[PDB]
């Protein structure tokens, strides 16, 4: 269901990383499979050729934490007005304090050790339940 439409109509786009993370752009191909593209360092931009009706999302390249693009989850290139590219402004969401604490704890503890932590079993499961593109495609469907 979530897949790019095969329009064959070019649309030039600027990916603009205004996050402090290294960004992984993901294209959803014509069968809905996520396809990763080259990463963008913090604060950098890339001018890229995409197509009308194509679907993109953006993740932290190291941890797969979710990012926003023009304030939402999904970016779809539109028709270019007077040869101007479309801006995709990539930013941090306001994470919940719980999700933000899980991110920091995951960045400090190897997965083999999550169980040694003195915390409730439901938090062990929250740590192990890493952010992942597949899981979010199931969610957004």
């Amino acid at each position: 269901v979530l897949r790019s439409v095969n329009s064959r109509e070019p649309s030039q786009v600027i990916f603009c990383n205004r996050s402090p993370r290294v960004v992984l752009p993901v294209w959803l191909n014509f069968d809905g499979e996520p396809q990763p593209y080259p990463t963008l360092p913090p604060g950098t931009g890339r001018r890229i050729h995409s197509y009308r009706g194509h679907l993109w999302l953006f993740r932290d390249a190291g941890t797969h934490d979710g990012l926003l693009v023009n304030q939402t989850e999904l970016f779809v290139p539109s028709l270019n007005v007077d040869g101007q590219p479309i801006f995709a402004n990539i930013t941090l969401p306001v994470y919940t304090l719980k999700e933000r604490c899980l991110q920091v704890v995951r960045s400090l503890v190897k997965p083999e050790n999550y169980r040694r932590l003195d915390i409730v079993r439901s938090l062990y499961e929250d740590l192990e339940d890493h952010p992942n593109v597949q899981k979010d495609l199931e969610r957004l469907t």
Binding site: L108, V109, N113, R116, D118
Partner: protein
């Protein structure tokens, strides 16, 4: 521009915001609304320096880029008990324990 502050005395801490252009005295009015003590019974400090009433918060070094929502600037508060002012005293927060081995 908004500045984000923690106003602190003993074991009390107030989180509030104010304008860079607002005055020390206007911040004492805010404290008055919360702790019920008038401005004349209050002294405000930045570190060990007593702040003058007519100065703006910006002039006193509270700016929008240092007094941030996620890391607010500390303003010290002392009360006058009857005749004279107590000395500035801010009880520190508790100490985090040692990092566990796995961290």
């Amino acid at each position: 521009m908004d500045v984000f502050l923690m106003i602190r005395r003993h074991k009390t801490t107030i989180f509030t915001d104010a304008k860079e252009s607002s005055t020390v005295f206007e911040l004492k009015r805010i404290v008055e609304g919360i702790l019920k003590r008038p401005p004349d019974e209050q002294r405000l400090y930045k570190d060990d320096q007593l702040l003058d009433d007519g100065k703006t918060l910006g002039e006193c070094g509270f700016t929008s880029q240092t007094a941030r929502p996620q890391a607010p600037a500390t303003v010290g508060l002392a009360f006058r008990a009857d005749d004279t002012f107590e000395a500035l005293c801010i009880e520190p927060f508790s100490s985090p324990p040692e990092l566990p081995d796995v961290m």
